[PDB]
Design a protein around this ligand. Structure first.
Ligand SMILES: [Ca+2]
Ligand SMILES: [Ca+2]
Ligand SMILES: [Fe+3]
Ligand SMILES: [Fe+3]
Lengths: 456, 436
């Protein structure tokens, strides 16, 4: 038969042999050493889960959804090849994640290389191609009825989106709903977001109220404005609300934790101080930095969380400055929270301007002059985005439902409005004179940047 | 005021500032990089938890039990300092675990240094002393009412044991029940096992039936043969049997997994071929081997699961042989399972003769000659090791080894060969006939 995996969130998981061949690969097993939340592990002891089990769950849920729609609506012409293609897309959607997951692409790369526009989804596509190329997956695809020329393009489009009128080339327009499963761009609701909602809740002691298996059993494909979309049963709006609340509770209590995000900036600070002295060997023996390893998948395969311990256990004097910061984490001698603000009604801060932010705070002009002159090297500016690629909107407005009487047409038509971006400032000095001075600079920068007034 | 932890098993737990000082320590944060189940992670994806979260739970449960006894029995004179000592003891009981937990002291060390005797508890006390000294914890202990002379001895004794008559020095026999909490050496029912019963079930998807909370609630200390022992209520024996079934289920389905133990042996083998070339920095620039890092505690502090990846990501030609085996874990090209047996007598194979076992199998002469001759290196033999609880009346509140053999050759001929060797080796060691 085929492999069975006992997941603590989904139960028994059945693995097609093609999936097994993709998993038993250094590019996929790489995800065993990538913390799902990263710095959150040092705040929540149960947050020890890695990207490996998350990807296994996303592929399982993607196959469950596509198989349910096929067996419930034969008119959709869903093939078993389409089921496996969606499963692979769910398995390999997080292949491009770097050390400590969103810390790498969200903060480190913008700080070390602000000129490059890099996302972990781009790396997922590059790592997928490197995976199939380095392990002879294409003949195994042909074994199981797949056509690599268009199916691999279909998988990549499911992971990253269109590759620059129907813009997708992997599947015709009459199967547009297949592009809404692994990563939905219309509303953000997808099986990928469902897996870590349950996984993170399971690992942090927060309660999950969204029954995702109930949602799959009532998911149907329907015609909405001449477009085939995956619709929900009307009697599932209460489950939908519970899903929204569960994501906000995770954001308010875990993702935006004030100490966990500090630790993320400290790990980023150590990585930045160590970027000039670590060497990762790529294809042809070429030495790559931590920041430049994203240009070479052969080197990026060797870039996991152990570079944290490589720096911590290093004896090189060149790495001492970076080693000291990591030692500070073990002693809980963390950076000091100065304050928090928010760009309500303002244009959100972009990744390419992260590097200029601490120099902008140190350049503030407080009225009350103090005997403590602070430099930009004493300030850390943290930008926390609940979704960097999103604009303020209610997702229910982009969710379509169906009735039991009209199971092919949608319906013409308490939720917590959520902040998107939070600006936190930390100081590296620990003395009360500098710590109070940094607070003065920060409140002055909040009026200049036209951000909300800091309270405390 | 004290720090609060959100734990998936126990919920919100409060940490005394002394405990926090011990936690904020590289000697203790080392536990963040030590898989609890080791090779079991490569079979169960949810088993990503480390020893750090488990130690926190044991330190919490031990304090809960002592506090519950003191509150429910003000005659025991259990002081807040007695509570802290038990909390620290459970918090530091596993400080001596090496890479991938029990495969380091249970297989690797006996294979690399068969002459040395080493256990993770005997290393946990060394870790505790090094932890206390390197961080100046004794003054912090005193400022919270802890006297270091008696207490350090107390904490060490309820971890490793006494170092005819009452052999403990940290507490008198009047507080003997305190030594039965973190690790019981009589029947084997401690809060340590309670924590990783629920925690492992929670991460493996295995159903946990024991409720440690309702047990602790109805737990009291009674007199058994003129001695004070922890006893349970007469109607809470259903919880006791659910504990025993959860243990049996965890061993049968998780701790004794086929592929899981094969991965452990494969990781041991790569460590053995990487032992002569990996350098661990120790006390004052000195260099130790992976097998010799246990002699220096500062070198052991830097011995974690990261060794697995320094071998994997290495480019040293001397490390090529070890790097090959770790890569075969990623490609799922594992050792083939040959057979399984157990000793017929009460005698049990110790660790000083683990490396002699594969050659014994290869030295066997099967009764029928065959084509493939097998070397000792082609065999892997790992050893898997595994009613007496007091109670009280509600009215009157008082009064073994398993042997598995694997083959590194994975072809039809060599596997038939290995089975013939294994059957013959079981025959002249008087072991149970292998099930076909
Ligand atoms: Ca992703
Ligand atoms: Ca133990
Ligand atoms: Fe994901
Ligand atoms: Fe333990």
């Amino acid at each position: 038969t085929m492999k069975v995996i006992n997941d603590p969130i989904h139960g028994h998981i059945e693995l097609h042999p093609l999936l097994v061949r993709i998993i038993d690969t250094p590019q996929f097993q790489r995800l065993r050493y990538i913390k799902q939340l990263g710095g959150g592990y040092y705040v929540f002891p149960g947050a020890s889960h890695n990207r490996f089990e998350h990807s296994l769950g996303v592929g399982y849920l993607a196959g469950c959804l596509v198989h349910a729609l096929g067996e419930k609506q034969p008119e959709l012409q869903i093939s078993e090849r389409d089921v496996l293609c969606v499963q692979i897309a769910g398995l390999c959607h997080d292949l491009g994640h770097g050390p400590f997951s969103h810390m790498f692409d969200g903060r480190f790369i913008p700080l070390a290389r602000p000129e490059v526009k890099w996302t972990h989804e781009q790396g997922s596509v590059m790592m997928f191609e490197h995976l199939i190329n380095s392990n002879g997956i294409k003949p195994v695809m042909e074994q199981y009825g797949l056509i690599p020329e268009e199916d691999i393009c279909f998988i990549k489009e499911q992971i990253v989106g269109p590759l620059e009128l129907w813009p997708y080339k992997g599947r015709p327009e009459n199967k547009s709903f297949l592009y809404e499963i692994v990563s939905n761009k219309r509303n953000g609701i997808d099986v990928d977001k469902w897996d870590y909602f349950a996984r993170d809740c399971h690992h942090l002691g927060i309660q999950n109220n969204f029954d995702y298996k109930r949602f799959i059993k009532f998911a149907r494909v329907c015609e909405v404005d001449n477009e085939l979309r995956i619709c929900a049963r009307d009697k599932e709006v209460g489950n939908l609300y519970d899903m929204f609340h569960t994501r906000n509770s995770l954001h308010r209590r875990a993702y935006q934790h004030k100490v966990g995000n500090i630790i993320d900036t400290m790990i980023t600070d150590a990585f930045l101080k160590a970027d000039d002295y670590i060497e990762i060997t790529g294809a042809g023996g070429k030495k790559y930095r931590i920041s430049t390893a994203i240009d070479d998948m052969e080197a990026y395969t060797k870039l996991t969380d152990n570079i944290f311990l490589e720096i911590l256990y290093s004896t090189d004097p060149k790495l001492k400055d970076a080693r000291e910061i990591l030692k500070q984490i073990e002693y809980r001698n963390l950076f000091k929270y100065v304050g928090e603000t928010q760009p309500t009604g303002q244009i959100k801060i972009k990744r390419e301007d992260y590097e200029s932010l601490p120099k902008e705070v140190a350049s503030a002009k407080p009225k009350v002059l103090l005997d403590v002159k602070l430099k930009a090297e004493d300030f850390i500016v943290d930008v926390i985005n609940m979704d960097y690629g999103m604009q303020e909107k209610n997702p229910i407005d982009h969710v379509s439902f169906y009735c039991k009487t009209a199971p092919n047409r949608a319906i013409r038509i308490l939720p917590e409005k959520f902040a998107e971006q939070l600006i936190r400032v930390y100081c590296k000095k620990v003395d009360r004179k500098s710590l109070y001075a940094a607070r003065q600079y920060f409140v002055q920068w909040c009026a200049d940047r036209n951000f909300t007034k800091p309270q405390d």
